Short mmCIF file of N, CA and C in Angstrom, two decimals:
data_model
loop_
_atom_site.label_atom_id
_atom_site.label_comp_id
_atom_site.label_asym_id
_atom_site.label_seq_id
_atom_site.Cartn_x
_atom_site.Cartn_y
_atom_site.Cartn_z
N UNK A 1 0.84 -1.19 0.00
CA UNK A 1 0.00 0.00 0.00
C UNK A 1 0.87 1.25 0.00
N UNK A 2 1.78 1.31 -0.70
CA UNK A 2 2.92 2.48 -1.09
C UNK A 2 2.39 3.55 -1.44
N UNK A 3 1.18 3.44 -2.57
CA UNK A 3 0.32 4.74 -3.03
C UNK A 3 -0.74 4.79 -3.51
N UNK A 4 -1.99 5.43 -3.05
CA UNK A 4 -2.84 5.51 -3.04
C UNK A 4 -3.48 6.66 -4.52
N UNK A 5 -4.65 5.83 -4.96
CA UNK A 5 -5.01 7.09 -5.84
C UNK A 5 -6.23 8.47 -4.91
N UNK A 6 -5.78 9.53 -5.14
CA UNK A 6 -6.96 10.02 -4.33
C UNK A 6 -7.14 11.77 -5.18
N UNK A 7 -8.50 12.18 -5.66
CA UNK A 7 -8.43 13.45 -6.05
C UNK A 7 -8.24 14.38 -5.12
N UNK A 8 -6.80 15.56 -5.69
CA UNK A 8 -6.76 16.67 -5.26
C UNK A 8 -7.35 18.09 -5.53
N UNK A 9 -6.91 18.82 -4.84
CA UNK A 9 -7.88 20.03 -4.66
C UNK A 9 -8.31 20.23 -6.03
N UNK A 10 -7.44 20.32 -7.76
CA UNK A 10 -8.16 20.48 -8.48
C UNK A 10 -7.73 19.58 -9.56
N UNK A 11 -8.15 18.89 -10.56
CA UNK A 11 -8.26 17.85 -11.16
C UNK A 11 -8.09 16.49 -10.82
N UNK A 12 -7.18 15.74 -10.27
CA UNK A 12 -7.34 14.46 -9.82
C UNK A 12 -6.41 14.16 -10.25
N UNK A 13 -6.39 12.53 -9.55
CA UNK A 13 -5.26 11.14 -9.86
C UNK A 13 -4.43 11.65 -9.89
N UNK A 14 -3.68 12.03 -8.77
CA UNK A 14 -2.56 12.39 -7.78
C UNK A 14 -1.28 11.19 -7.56
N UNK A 15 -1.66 10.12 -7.28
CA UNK A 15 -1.25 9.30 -6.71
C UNK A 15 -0.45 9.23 -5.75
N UNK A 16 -0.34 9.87 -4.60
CA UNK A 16 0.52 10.16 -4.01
C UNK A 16 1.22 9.04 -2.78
N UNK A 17 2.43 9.35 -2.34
CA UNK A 17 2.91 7.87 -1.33
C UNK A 17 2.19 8.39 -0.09
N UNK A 18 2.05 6.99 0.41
CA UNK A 18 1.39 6.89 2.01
C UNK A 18 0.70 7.34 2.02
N UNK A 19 12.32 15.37 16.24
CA UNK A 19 12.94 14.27 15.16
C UNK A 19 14.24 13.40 15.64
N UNK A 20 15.30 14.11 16.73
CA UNK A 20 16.21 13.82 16.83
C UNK A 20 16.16 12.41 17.55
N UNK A 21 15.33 12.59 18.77
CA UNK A 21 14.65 11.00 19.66
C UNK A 21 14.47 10.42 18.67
N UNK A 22 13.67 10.30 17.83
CA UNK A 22 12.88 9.12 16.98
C UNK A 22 13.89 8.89 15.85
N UNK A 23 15.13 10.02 15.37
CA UNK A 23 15.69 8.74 14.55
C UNK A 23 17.06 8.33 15.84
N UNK A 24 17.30 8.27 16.82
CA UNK A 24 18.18 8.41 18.17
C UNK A 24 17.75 6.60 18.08
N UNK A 25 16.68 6.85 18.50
CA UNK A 25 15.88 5.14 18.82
C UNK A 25 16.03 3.91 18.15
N UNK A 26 16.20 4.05 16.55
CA UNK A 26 16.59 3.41 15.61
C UNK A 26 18.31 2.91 16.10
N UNK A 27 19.14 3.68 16.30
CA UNK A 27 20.12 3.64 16.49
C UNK A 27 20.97 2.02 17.24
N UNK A 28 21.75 1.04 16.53
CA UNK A 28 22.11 0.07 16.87
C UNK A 28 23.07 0.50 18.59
N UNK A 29 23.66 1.43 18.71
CA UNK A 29 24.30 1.12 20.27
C UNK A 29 23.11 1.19 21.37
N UNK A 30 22.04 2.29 20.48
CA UNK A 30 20.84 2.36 21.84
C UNK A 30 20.43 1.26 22.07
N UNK A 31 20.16 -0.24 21.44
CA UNK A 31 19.89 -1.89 21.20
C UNK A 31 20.80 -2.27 22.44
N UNK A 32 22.50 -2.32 21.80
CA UNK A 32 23.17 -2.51 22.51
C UNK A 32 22.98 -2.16 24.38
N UNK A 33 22.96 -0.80 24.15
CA UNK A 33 22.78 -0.85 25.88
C UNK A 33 21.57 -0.34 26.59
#
């Protein structure tokens, strides 16, 4: 479900797809300890 068709404000078929903590969290040493 990568992209959806959906009309925009004016003509249509768009298709369009679909800080520091949240990419911190990802982080393999934060795993580690």
């Amino acid at each position: 479900t990568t992209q959806m068709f959906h009309e925009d404000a004016a003509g249509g078929w768009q298709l369009v797809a679909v800080a520091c903590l949240q990419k911190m969290m990802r982080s393999s040493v934060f795993h580690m300890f």
